[PDB]
């Protein structure tokens, strides 16, 4: 609700992979309907013998019992199904979703921004994958600096030199080995009054 934005990272929107097509399947006979081809590794609107849902269908290693048709998780949500035509187990994964945040330096500085899609592999969406999600618009840099804008999992971002947003593993401070020995001591010769 502002015409000016300070430097930082802001949670703006939500990203939600949308389904591609509807998969309706019935046993090898006639389940009072016309079956469709099975689509794997894709966000689809599946319907198995009236059990409807939306998700990604993958080949599962779970071993349903002969009489078992569906699988449920701890929260009692559809976790896997058995294809009515070929007796195989399809694991169901919720279609990728997450938050969408905007990493920006202060608008008084520049209008360039980067976008973080939280907890999503951006193969599904100047692209940098990180444990916190995928960052787009930021240039990954090997050099480590002080954390200007925190992203997460040790990754921060900053507006640096011609100027652009860079992402880097934040440094914890200068390394300073202490000249320890069994007979040497350091003593101050002067002092300062600090307020």
């Amino acid at each position: 609700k502002s015409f000016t934005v300070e430097k930082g990272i802001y949670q703006t929107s939500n990203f939600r992979v949308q389904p591609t097509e509807s998969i309706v399947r019935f046993p090898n006979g006639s389940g009072s309907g016309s079956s469709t081809n099975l689509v794997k590794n894709k966000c689809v609107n599946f319907n198995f013998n009236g059990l409807t849902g939306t998700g990604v269908l993958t080949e599962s290693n779970k071993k349903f019992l002969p009489f078992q048709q569906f699988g449920r998780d701890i929260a009692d949500t559809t976790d896997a199904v058995r294809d009515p035509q070929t007796l195989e187990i399809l694991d169901i994964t919720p279609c990728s979703f997450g938050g969408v945040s905007v990493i920006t330096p202060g608008t008084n500085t520049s209008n360039q921004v980067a976008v973080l899609y939280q907890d999503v592999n951006c193969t599904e969406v100047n692209v940098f994958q990180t444990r916190a999600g995928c960052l787009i618009g930021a240039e990954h840099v090997n050099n480590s600096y002080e954390c200007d804008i925190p992203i997460g999992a040790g990754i921060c971002a900053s507006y640096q030199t011609s100027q652009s947003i860079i992402a880097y593993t934040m440094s914890l401070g200068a390394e300073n080995s202490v000249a320890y020995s069994n007979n040497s001591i350091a003593i101050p010769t002067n002092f300062t009054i600090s307020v």
């Binding site: 929260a75 979703f97 907890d119 401070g173 390394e175 300073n176 202490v178 320890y180 040497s184 350091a186």
Partner: protein, 349 residues
């Protein structure tokens, strides 16, 4: 002795729309009539997460530079192997840290903490190196090296024991220190040692489980499945049922967020206490009784732990007391003499 303190908790975030009205435009339209509850809840949770990052920063990032111990481990007979990082391990955790560390999709997500466990381990290693190589000087200004034996002599002077005692019992003191560290190792290996910390983790897990389970309830509605209601009733009745479900689920979210705020305040207090102990117990010698374990505080060593910190408090405890006759003063030539520092004692003669 060992003291364990929670520092932070999981940074949870909830997509209210997916939680209540998952995949229902009509249900989202109905949500719109309830105002800006979603924005308020998101603001609260984001504030909690930022506060968790702040808590970790306060507790651990109390050192200006990353200090490192010398390659030669000659500290006058004191063995710190059980607390210093193990160079061979890919993740440079100390054995005690290894012992410590060894011990759903309805719009709910977990944000990674800003500082990885490796960075916290680096901070702990810096603190340990500073304490070992420079005593408490690095906590005030420029780190000043000092032989560890002389440092321990100063520690003894702090608790009112003449430093000659340490120089005359150095080997015995080193043996006792090493044995105590080994006992800490064994005690953690065998032992419910992680208390309030595991309680925090369990409370958060239970809160999330309750929030998820509340979705399956009806709150009086004909069904707990939104699409069921949409596909079995006309809009005039479907909207009433959806309103009932929305009210129930929104109340559940509000309860969850309020309880999370209370827990966040509690853990903020705990992290403040942990930071105070790091400052007054590790970066110095504390004269506050029982603030750093039983006995007279000699020093402390920090160790990281899942969402928490562990302090190894090294203290001095009197062991073998003996009786003597005492007197407040002594007469020599009509004048009373009082001890400058100590007591007058008599074995009988």
């Amino acid at each position: 002795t060992t003291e364990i303190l929670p520092v932070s908790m999981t940074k949870t975030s909830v997509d209210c729309t997916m939680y209540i009205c998952g995949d229902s435009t009509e249900c989202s339209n109905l949500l719109l009539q309830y105002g800006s509850f979603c924005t308020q809840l998101n603001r609260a949770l984001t504030g909690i997460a930022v506060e968790q990052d702040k808590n970790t920063q306060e507790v651990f990032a109390q050192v200006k530079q990353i200090y490192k111990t010398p390659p030669i481990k000659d500290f006058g007979g004191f063995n710190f192997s059980q607390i210093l990082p193990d160079p061979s391990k890919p993740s440079k955790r100390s054995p005690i840290e290894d012992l410590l560390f060894n011990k759903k999709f309805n719009g709910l997500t977990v944000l990674p903490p800003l500082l990885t466990d490796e960075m916290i381990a680096q901070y702990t290693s810096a603190l340990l190196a500073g304490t070992i190589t420079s005593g408490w000087t690095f906590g005030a200004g420029p780190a000043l090296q000092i032989p560890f034996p002389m440092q321990m002599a100063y520690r003894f002077n702090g608790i009112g024991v003449t430093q000659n005692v340490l120089y005359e019992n150095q080997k015995l003191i080193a043996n006792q220190f090493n044995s105590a560290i080994g006992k800490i190792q064994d005690s953690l290996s065998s032992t419910s040692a992680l208390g309030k910390l595991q309680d925090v983790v369990n409370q958060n897990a239970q809160a999330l489980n309750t929030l998820v389970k509340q979705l399956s309830s009806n709150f009086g509605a004909i069904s707990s499945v939104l699409n069921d209601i949409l596909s079995r009733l006309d809009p005039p009745e479907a909207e009433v049922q959806i309103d009932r479900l929305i009210t129930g689920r929104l109340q559940s979210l509000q309860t969850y967020v309020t309880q999370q705020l209370i827990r966040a305040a509690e853990i903020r207090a705990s992290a403040n206490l942990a930071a105070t102990k790091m400052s007054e117990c590790v970066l110095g010698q504390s004269k506050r009784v029982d603030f750093c374990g039983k006995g007279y505080h000699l020093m402390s060593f920090p160790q990281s732990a899942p969402h928490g910190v562990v302090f190894l408090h090294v203290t001095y405890v009197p062991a073998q007391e003996k009786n003597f006759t005492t007197a407040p003063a002594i007469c020599h030539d009509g004048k009373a003499h009082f001890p400058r520092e100590g007591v007058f004692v008599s074995n009988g003669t």
